[PDB]
């Protein structure tokens, strides 16, 4: 309980007493692997774990989600006219209330505790069309959302994917060269994944001329400077087995 709770439990000590509730770390580690055998690659049987953990999280957290203030801020600055078909249409389409209890948000948090068994990824449909131009305003707002939500996902390739999305919309005004054979600046961003195809310019932003591609260079430097640093913390009790495999 991280000492959020203090408890007392009286018990009588008879000579002949049995409480079979202990297991060694080796047993737990062996049990954990056995789950991997039983789950195999069947995604369907892996999902419930994240589902249960997220359910507990919601039942426990004190945080409250309410877009009412955000709505008021938007509605006064927007004209809220059932007009302005420009992205006021779009953002309203996403602002309006959802009955899903924002399950997606909790799923991400839950997946953190089970990464390496299941990874949250940005939904394929969320990306803009790689053939679309940056001028197409709804595409621009999509990239904004993707960039904001990036760090929440457990996918290690999210940084690259986020970067490529903007690069796609800037293909015409910012024609950079991608040093990966078999790929192009117009390639769909969601396709990149595997580390071997990380663009060298993304690896080293100095390969992008500022005067020629200012926005892309700034975006890369912004990502490399502000993407959060992972950390760690303890849990459990030293009186029990750990069940951890790698960490």
């Amino acid at each position: 309980a991280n000492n959020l709770l203090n408890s007392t439990i009286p018990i009588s000590l008879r000579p002949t007493i049995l409480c079979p509730w202990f297991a060694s770390s080796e047993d737990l580690r062996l049990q954990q692997v056995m789950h991997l055998v039983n789950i195999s690659s069947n995604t369907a049987a892996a999902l419930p774990l994240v589902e249960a953990l997220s359910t507990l999280l919601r039942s426990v957290t004190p945080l409250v989600l309410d877009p009412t203030v955000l709505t008021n801020a938007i509605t006064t600055i927007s004209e809220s006219t059932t007009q302005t078909i420009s992205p006021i249409s779009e953002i309203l389409r996403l602002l309006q209330p959802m009955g899903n209890d924002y399950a997606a948000f909790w799923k991400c948090i839950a997946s953190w505790a089970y990464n390496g068994l299941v990874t949250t990824v940005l939904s394929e449909d969320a990306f803009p069309d790689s053939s679309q131009s940056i001028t197409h305003l709804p595409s621009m707002w999509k990239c904004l959302f993707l960039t904001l939500a990036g760090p929440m996902t457990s996918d290690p390739h999210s940084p690259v994917k986020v970067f490529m999305a903007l690069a796609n919309l800037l293909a015409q005004p910012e024609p950079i060269a991608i040093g990966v054979p078999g790929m192009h600046q117009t390639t769909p961003a969601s396709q990149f994944s595997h580390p071997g195809v990380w663009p060298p310019g993304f690896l080293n932003p100095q390969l992008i001329n500022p005067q020629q591609a200012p926005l892309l260079r700034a975006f890369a430097e912004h990502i490399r400077a502000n993407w959060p640093q992972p950390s760690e913390f303890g849990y459990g009790s030293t009186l029990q087995g750990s069940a951890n495999l790698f960490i």
């Binding site: 079979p20 062996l30 056995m34 039983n38 995604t43 999902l47 989600l65 877009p67 993407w227």
Partner: protein
């Protein structure tokens, strides 16, 4: 471990090894390798995530101690914490026994004492091993009245002729990190070895006899103890004038 932006430390695969690859009969690599991502993929919509990020609020009298203490208490009323330990222990015992059984059946394999090796048994292929493991797995589940998976996966797919489980993940820099999970001190297997050892000396009590069978036409009129003859055997394999039938 999360890796942020270190390209050389990015993970490409997470795989389970039933046998250390140096000892494997054939490649027989994990099925997971056929997937684009090292783990199961769960698509999520960024817009919903963004909304939750932008509007997060609290109640007007949030005392963290009071809220958490009230919230966490019901969870500790559960007993999942202990059932976890109990199931894990049973899993170990079943695993050790099941591995031992298959090893004793195949002509060579994981190093285990072989008290019953004198008995006749054709060398089991992978398909046969699955049958044996299925029998063992069912026996334990019936015995301890469990539900769930237990050892299901080992028999249902892949080679059941396992040796020593281990998990590993591979980094783009070529480095591979492997963790073995050898089972701890087992108990049931130890006494089972004793049972087999003593059976090999008391097989008569199980309506099983050892040795060959003679078929001499005896037309005597006195005592007769076929299960323990006292007279010398009429002949043996190497004896003079003794023929051995052909293969057909």
């Amino acid at each position: 471990p999360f890796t942020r932006l270190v390209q050389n430390d990015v993970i490409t695969n997470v795989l389970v090894a039933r046998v250390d690859p140096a000892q494997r009969g054939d490649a027989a690599v994990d099925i997971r390798a056929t997937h684009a991502t090292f783990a199961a993929a769960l698509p999520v919509d960024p817009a919903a995530i963004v909304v939750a990020m932008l509007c997060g609020q609290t109640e007007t009298n949030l005392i963290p101690s009071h809220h958490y203490g009230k919230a966490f208490a019901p969870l500790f009323a559960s007993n999942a914490m202990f059932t976890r330990n109990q199931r894990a222990v049973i899993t170990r015992e079943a695993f050790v026994c099941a591995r031992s059984a298959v090893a004793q059946c195949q002509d060579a394999g994981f190093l285990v004492p072989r008290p019953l090796d004198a008995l006749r048994q054709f060398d089991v292929t992978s398909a046969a091993a699955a049958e044996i493991m299925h029998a063992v797995n069912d026996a334990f589940k019936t015995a301890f009245d469990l539900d769930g998976a237990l050892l299901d996966g080992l028999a249902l797919y892949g080679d059941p002729r396992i040796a020593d489980l281990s998990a590993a993940y591979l980094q783009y820099g070529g480095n591979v990190v492997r963790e073995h999970v050898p089972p701890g001190p087992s108990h049931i297997h130890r006494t089972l070895q004793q049972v087999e050892s003593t059976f090999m000396a008391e097989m008569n009590l199980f309506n099983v006899a050892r040795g060959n069978l003679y078929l001499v036409q005896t037309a005597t009129n006195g005592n007769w103890s076929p299960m323990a003859p006292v007279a010398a055997p009429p002949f043996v394999r190497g004896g003079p004038n003794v023929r051995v039938v052909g293969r057909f």
